[PDB]
Amino acid sequence: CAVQVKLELGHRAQVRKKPTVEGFTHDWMVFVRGPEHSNIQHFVEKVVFHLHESFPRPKRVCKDPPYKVEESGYAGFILPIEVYFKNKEEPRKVRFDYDLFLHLEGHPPVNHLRCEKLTFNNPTEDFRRKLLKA
Ligand SMILES: COCC(=O)Nc1ccc(Cl)c(N)c1
Numbered sequence: 001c002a003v004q005v006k007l008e009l010g011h012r013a014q015v016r017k018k019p020t021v022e023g024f025t026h027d028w029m030v031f032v033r034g035p036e037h038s039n040i041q042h043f044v045e046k047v048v049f050h051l052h053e054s055f056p057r058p059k060r061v062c063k064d065p066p067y068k069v070e071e072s073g074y075a076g077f078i079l080p081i082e083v084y085f086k087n088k089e090e091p092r093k094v095r096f097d098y099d100l101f102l103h104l105e106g107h108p109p110v111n112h113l114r115c116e117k118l119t120f121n122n123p124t125e126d127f128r129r130k131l132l133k134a
Pocket residue numbers: 024052054055056072073074075076077
């Protein structure tokens with residue numbers, strides 16, 4: 001008995017009124033969430049955000065919602081996002097590569113949304129019940 005769930009991936013990016021001491025020009029926030037009124041905490045063990053190596057401690061872990069990272073920077077990069085599941089079966093996790101892009105000054109702030117579908121063809125009964133609670 002197969003079950004399908006959706007994950008929304010996205011980010012906001014805004015030019016700062018004043019750069020940081022480091023010269024960071026943008027504030028940004030990247031997130032993973034379920035579609036509105038769905039709680040993916042039922043089946044999500046954790047979300048791991050792999051920032052660019054220039055950031056201190058680039059492996060940002062969110063064990064609880066909201067699964068998000070608020071940061072400042074000066075450039076965009078590829079941000080691998082691992083979503084770990086509350087199970088002990090294949091798959092234990094899924095990985096996406098998120099394009100964390102920033103817009104130049106004068107353009108409206110970035111408000112970007114992606115949707116990814118997760119198909120689980122034969123999950124265990126406990127995992128299926130978690131997926132169906134979201
Ligand atoms: C210290 O972090 C601030 C920052 O934005 N670092 C950063 C981000 C993306 C790229 Cl591609 C590079 N080279 C550096």
